[PDB]
């Protein structure tokens, strides 16, 4: 089978910029490659089809070249929207092949998140457990740390954390952080508190609660 | 305009077989192929066969003994079957459609169907609010809790409420079940006058809620 390798595996650039993207075949396939965009949580979108044709409905800013064994998709003047992975697929040779994607990042200014910080509900509570959430809001860069604390005791290894891809519009992350208590344990204790660090921030941010108030 | 439909997630336990319908519109399966292609978590794209036009099937190398695909081109149905499944079967499964009635540029695809493979019960989310409390902006959400397997679709007030709206990755916790939460933000005038909703499908076990949030008293 052919082996399409897509390079580079992460491409990291700011809005309005001349952006291009890789797929090397491990033998030549003439000029039988098809590109995809593929936005999170959404299906595979075709751009262009044998190397350079254009698709009904793609817009201008995309393109591609190349014949043999090196192709280029290129996006000349890069938007926010455009955040996605980028695959290539040859047909030349059965079976049809897909190269593993380049994920396209984008650039933009630092921003602080908005922290908020949720007590459990009283619904949960007579389930015998108590998540406690802490939510960073809107932000850039991704890095970001959040530390929880009870009553001063540092919690280390009860809670989880996931963060949503960049937002098409902004380009900023949102972050979730769940610290997960028995029911027992949050009773026998007040205060309940998430700090966050970030670039944006120049201090770290507390958000807390005591329960019960 | 040309749609391809395909049936919900599901759990498939291990050694037993995965059957997914493709419900076309928009064309007619007597005029195209039909084919299939799985993308593994955090991978890319491997395609797995087809069914064309005539009937003719052909099926990729790995699955040429446990595949099967068949359709039904009265009811615009393509069937796909494949026997025998392990742990890394576990993938999104898309039916798709090429420009050309021979061809192999897939223009039009199916919405997905996530397959978990494991030897678990399925188990559906309990819902619990994540209340406003007291720069003019509330946030509000809800945690979805406790199920298995992934996925599940959040959305708020009917899908009316779009802006704001943040619906994070699940995490898998140490129990083998997953949570997540959904969070949005709004006016802080707005609590006492709109409500807000949050709709919580988890297809694998024919679970839907909707979650009320609002201001704790």
């Known amino acids: 089978d052919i082996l399409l390798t897509q390079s580079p595996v992460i491409l990291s650039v700011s809005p309005g910029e001349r952006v291009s993207f890789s797929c090397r075949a491990s033998?030549?396939?003439?000029?039988?490659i098809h590109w995809y965009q593929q936005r999170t949580n959404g299906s595979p979108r075709l751009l262009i089809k044998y190397a350079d044709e254009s698709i009904d409905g793609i817009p201008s800013r995309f393109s591609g070249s190349g014949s043999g064994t090196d192709f280029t998709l290129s996006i000349n003047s890069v938007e926010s929207e455009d955040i996605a992975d980028y695959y290539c697929?040859?047909?030349?040779?059965?079976?049809?092949?897909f190269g593993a994607g380049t994920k396209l990042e984008l650039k933009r200014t630092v921003a602080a998140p908005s922290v908020f910080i949720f007590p459990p509900s009283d619904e949960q509570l007579k389930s015998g457990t108590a998540s406690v959430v802490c939510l960073l809001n809107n932000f850039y860069p991704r890095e970001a740390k959040v530390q929880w604390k009870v009553d001063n005791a540092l919690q280390s290894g009860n809670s989880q954390e996931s963060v949503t891809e960049q937002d098409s519009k902004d380009s900023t992350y949102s972050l979730s952080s769940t610290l997960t208590l028995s029911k027992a344990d949050y009773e026998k204790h007040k205060v309940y508190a998430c700090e966050v660090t970030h670039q944006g921030l120049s201090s770290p941010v507390t958000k807390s609660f005591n329960r019960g108030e | 305009q040309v749609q391809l439909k395909q049936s919900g997630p599901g759990l498939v336990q291990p050694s037993q077989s995965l059957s997914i319908t493709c419900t076309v519109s928009g064309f007619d399966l007597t005029d195209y192929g039909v084919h299939w292609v799985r993308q593994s978590p955090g991978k890319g794209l491997e395609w797995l066969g087809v069914?064309?036009?005539?009937?003719?099937?052909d099926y990729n190398t790995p699955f040429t003994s446990r595949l099967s695909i068949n359709k039904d081109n009265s009811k615009s149905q393509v069937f796909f079957k494949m026997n025998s499944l392990q742990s890394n079967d576990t993938a999104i499964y898309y039916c798709?459609?090429?420009?050309?009635?021979?061809?192999?540029?897939?223009?039009?695809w199916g919405q997905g169907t996530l397959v978990t493979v494991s030897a678990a019960s399925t188990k559906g989310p309990s819902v619990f609010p994540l209340a406003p409390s007291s720069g003019g902006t509330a946030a509000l959400g809800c945690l979805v809790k406790d199920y298995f397997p992934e996925p599940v679709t959040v959305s708020w007030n009917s899908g009316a409420l779009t802006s704001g709206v943040h619906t994070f990755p699940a995490v898998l916790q140490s129990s083998g079940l997953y949570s997540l939460s959904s969070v949005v933000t709004v006016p802080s005038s707005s609590l006492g006058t709109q409500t807000y909703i949050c709709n919580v499908n988890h297809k694998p076990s024919n679970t839907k809620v909707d979650k009320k949030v609002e201001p704790k008293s």
């Open positions: 697929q040859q047909n030349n040779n059965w079976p049809t092949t």
């Open positions: 033998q030549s396939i003439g000029t039988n």
């Open positions: 798709a459609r090429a420009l050309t009635y021979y061809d192999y540029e897939f223009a039009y």
């Open positions: 069914i064309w036009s005539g009937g003719n099937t």
